[PDB]
Structures are given as structure tokens and as C-alpha cells.
Design a protein around this ligand. Structure first.
Ligand SMILES: Cc1ccc(NC(=O)c2cccc(C(F)(F)F)c2)cc1-c1ccc2nc(NC3CC3)ncc2c1
Length: 335
């Protein structure tokens, strides 16, 4: 009965008063009220079952969210789906509503060094847990960082974005992607997530994304314009030879030091930024090393930076539906 921008949300009576937040390739997110627990929530409706890849992404989302519990990662409240597998065509994942996000905050505010520092700390604390579980986030960016009024930050994965027709918040954007993704089909690592954080830190230090551009080649040109042309050593770390020939073909660009781009930035912040935005993924700083960096010394406390107790280590969509039915069973009434 409640319908929001053409999507029915079969979610009452417990949850009511829906309001649109955004949509993606196969689902939609609204705010809503929880009457059982008397709290504002967010609810992600997804309809993945006709397509194999959406089913894979959905199973992965569910398994991760069941296992994960961390103060800097969005947490699951409930999963609503039909009592019968044949009847189940939509799944709704419920989590607590956060007031705002970094993407919105960056539009209205130049952030102080103190705020940058605390936000970066929480990003890294949350990411330490994700990475300790041997999970890759793969799409860190400001729209995927929730905030509230007291500067608490929570990592999100909003999910696969809507077709972009060749400016708004939930589009797929490439600005935070590591160069090895641009340059290679997947041999991807934790390191890509650290590059993304580097890009987010650079953006906090300024008023704009550091590596924009319409195509990969425009971005790579911006990247090379700041980092300088790759050393021979860096060229050798590029595994796809077609891509390595191409960088090899470009004019030499000199390195622009970070303190020339951000003349007013904290020098410790810039030292950490440099270590995150390193072209060679093997030399890129790892999440635990980043937490221990002098920039974060006000907050660093490994005894209070949890690791996951339960690390992770082909299928037809119909089979993936079964698996999804099983994983959601715990939230059914009769359990
Ligand atoms: C409702 C909901 C359900 C599921 C998810 N899923 C995840 O965040 C997710 C999925 C896969 C992996 C991971 C992660 F990060 F690796 F742990 C997270 C997010 C949400 C979600 C989406 C948007 C939200 N927006 C807000 N606030 C609006 C920005 C103002 N608050 C809570 C939200 C919560």
C-alpha cells in the first residue's frame, strides 16, 4: 500500500511513514518509523531474483551484515521477506537511520583539521574490521559515509547504482577508484580500499574531489599530474601489459608535492595522505599502519579497535534464492 516513487514497500504494519532517500539498479532506500522499537529507520528494498549477479550481491550483502557488528559500520536491525520462497520476490533490509553523510556535509562546510582527523580515524577503524574479516568494501566514497550530529561516522554500502545516462548523490562515480582498477581486470586487493580513503581525505582537505574527469584517461592524467610519472618500478607493478604500454606512452609529468596542493593542511595529514595515494599498491599503507600514523595519535587505541572474530574465506540465481531464503530465516516470526 505505501508506494514511493513507483515502488511499493510491503513493510507495514511494523514500519510505516516511508520517505524517499534514493534508488539503485535493483532496489530503493526509504526512511521509515519502527513501531515495535520506536525508532527512525532506513529500509533497503531490493528485487534481485531475476538476475544472477544481483542475487550474488544480495547474498554477499546479507552474509556480511549478519556477521558484522561494529560502531563504525551500519548495522542490521531486521530482514523482511515473504513466509514462502515462491512468494518471496523482494527483500527489505532494515538499519538505523543516520541524519546525514559526508557527501552532504562537504557541500556546506570546509572541514576543520580536527573534524578531518576524527572522521578519518573512524573510517580507518571501521575498515580495519572489514579488512580483518578478509572482506573488501570496493566502493568507498563520501556518499558511503554516514554521520550524525555528534560526528559519529558509519561505513555504508548503498549498493549498485542506477544506469547513468550518457551531479546527484548515489550515482556510480569512478573518482575514488584505484589506478590498478582503471589499468587491470581484477587482481584487486585491500589496497584499493586504502586508495579510496586517500581520495576521501584529499577531498576533506579541499573543496572538491581530487581526481575527477569524464573518462579513466582524464583521471589517470590528473593522477599522474600530481604523483608524477610512474617510476620504472611502478610500471612493473602494472600487471596488464596493454595498460603498462599505454602509461609508458605518456609525456613525463613531474611530481607536485602535497603541501603545494594543500598549503594549509596539517603536515602529518599530508604525510598520511601521501602513503595512501601511492601508485604501487604493494607500497600503499595498510589499514593498521594507517591507524598507527602520527596524524591519528589523539584517537589511536588498538585495544579498542576490534577485529572480526569470524573472517570469511558460479551458482544459478534459483540456487542463490534458496541460500538467501535460508540466511533470512532467523528474522521470521516463527523462529
Ligand atoms: C538500509 C540499509 C540496508 C542495507 C545497507 N547495506 C550496507 O550498508 C552494506 C552492504 C554491504 C556491505 C557493507 C559493508 F560496508 F561492507 F559493511 C554495508 C545499507 C542501508 C542503508 C542505506 C542508506 C542509509 N541512509 C541513511 N541516512 C541517509 C543518508 C542520510 N541512514 C542509514 C542508511 C542505511
Amino acid at each position: 500500500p505505501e508506494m514511493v516513487r513507483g515502488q511499493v514497500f510491503d513493510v507495514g504494519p511494523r514500519y510505516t511513514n516511508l520517505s524517499y532517500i534514493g534508488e539503485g539498479a535493483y532496489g530503493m532506500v526509504c526512511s521509515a518509523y519502527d513501531n515495535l522499537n520506536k525508532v527512525r529507520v532506513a529500509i533497503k528494498k531490493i528485487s534481485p531474483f531475476e538476475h544472477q549477479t544481483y542475487c550474488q550481491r544480495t547474498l554477499r550483502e546479507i552474509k556480511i551484515l549478519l556477521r558484522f557488528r561494529h560502531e563504525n559500520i551500519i548495522g542490521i536491525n531486521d530482514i523482511i521477506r515473504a513466509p514462502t520462497i515462491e512468494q518471496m520476490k523482494d527483500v527489505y533490509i532494515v538499519a538505523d537511520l543516520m541524519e546525514t553523510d559526508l557527501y552532504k556535509l562537504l557541500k556546506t562546510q570546509h572541514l576543520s583539521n580536527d573534524h578531518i582527523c576524527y572522521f578519518l580515524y573512524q573510517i580507518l577503524r571501521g575498515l580495519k574490521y572489514i579488512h580483518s574479516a578478509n572482506v573488501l568494501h570496493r566502493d568507498l566514497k563520501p556518499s558511503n559515509l554516514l554521520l550524525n550530529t555528534t560526528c559519529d561516522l558509519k561505513i555504508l554500502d548503498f549498493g549498485l547504482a542506477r544506469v547513468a545516462d550518457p551531479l546527484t548523490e548515489y550515482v556510480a562515480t569512478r573518482w575514488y577508484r584505484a589506478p590498478e582498477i582503471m589499468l587491470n581486470s581484477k587482481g584487486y586487493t585491500k589496497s584499493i580500499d586504502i586508495w579510496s580513503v586517500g581520495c576521501i581525505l584529499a577531498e576533506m582537505l579541499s573543496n572538491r574531489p581530487i581526481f575527477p574527469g569524464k573518462h579513466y584517461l582524464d583521471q589517470l592524467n590528473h593522477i599522474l599530474g600530481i604523483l608524477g610519472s610512474p617510476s620504472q618500478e611502478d610500471l612493473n607493478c602494472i600487471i596488464n601489459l596493454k595498460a603498462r604500454n599505454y602509461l609508458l606512452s605518456l609525456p613525463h609529468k613531474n611530481k607536485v608535492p602535497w603541501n603545494r596542493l594543500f598549503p594549509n593542511a596539517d603536515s602529518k595529514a599530508l604525510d598520511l595522505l601521501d602513503k595512501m595515494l601511492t601508485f604501487n599498491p604493494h607500497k600503499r599503507i595498510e589499514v593498521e599502519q594507517a591507524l598507527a600514523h602520527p596524524y591519528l595519535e589523539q584517537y589511536y587505541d588498538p585495544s579498542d579497535e576490534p577485529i572480526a572474530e569470524a573472517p570469511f574465506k558460479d551458482l544459478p540465481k534459483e540456487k542463490l534464492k534458496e541460500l538467501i531464503f535460508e540466511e533470512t530465516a532467523r528474522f521470521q516470526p516463527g523462529y
